[PDB]
Subunit: 176 residues, 2 copies
Amino acid sequence: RRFPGSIVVMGVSGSGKSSVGEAIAEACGYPFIEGDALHPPENIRKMSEGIPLTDDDRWPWLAAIGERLASREPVVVSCSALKRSYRDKLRESAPGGLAFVFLHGSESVLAERMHHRTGHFMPSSLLQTQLETLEDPRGEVRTVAVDVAQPLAEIVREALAGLARLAENLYFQSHH
Amino acid sequence: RRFPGSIVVMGVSGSGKSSVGEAIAEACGYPFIEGDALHPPENIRKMSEGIPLTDDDRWPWLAAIGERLASREPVVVSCSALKRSYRDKLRESAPGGLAFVFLHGSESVLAERMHHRTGHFMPSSLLQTQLETLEDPRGEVRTVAVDVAQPLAEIVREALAGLARLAENLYFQSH
């Protein structure tokens, strides 16, 4: 099928949210929005310096993410959405209608993939902090988890299959 | 004495361009533009990952910086402007009317300043690559250099004193 609602592709920095998010969006005929582009100036400066963001820094960004997810027509947005707080809020912007695709891997695989993809290693401090901040979403509602230690085309096919199952469940409750 | 034109506060990441840029803007009654806010989505993702930007990545951003500098009314914009290529292009947006405030310091002073300010150390690799990319602007036209190993209020006063000198020189070539 095809999930009848907005999709957030989450996961730590460097996990591939934008690549996966764009492929998902194209496959579903939905527009893709890169979450990074909605950070206020202050946040970008910190990221530019390689300094971690605080909860306070994120909230106005998450608010802007939430507003995009609230549109009528479905949208696919890349957003790390590391904490449970962040995801629960985002869900309120589209109650019972928001799906999350969780891209995940160990520090080693994540680091290797970035180097294998850009020729550069992400600073170890950045990646570890992301991982310590990450609160595993598995178990939470309408969440599809996909490991990244596989071809990109496989990661996308699997994310879409997971979304198709979520769609199946909706078409079921909607028709008792 | 205000410099009659736009001002770019340059220098590597963490040098304090935004703090100084905002102070200068207030002092001159000019609006301040945070250069970082004009990076296209692709650039922000790389910075978020702690990955350096390439020359190709920067030009779209530099074009947007140039467009803001081109307005008729003077603006103060924070922009690292590390290479001479970048600065020369930005000058073209405001022919003979652009001033640069170069904030600089050694790697250790820069690193400690950031820790002292945010409780965090900038990743060493990021700071080293910035400094490696930095092409010293001293000697280029209408450029005021200021070392950061001193109080912020002193950095600002000195930047403005330097801009006042540039203004004085224009007021001379003009009359």
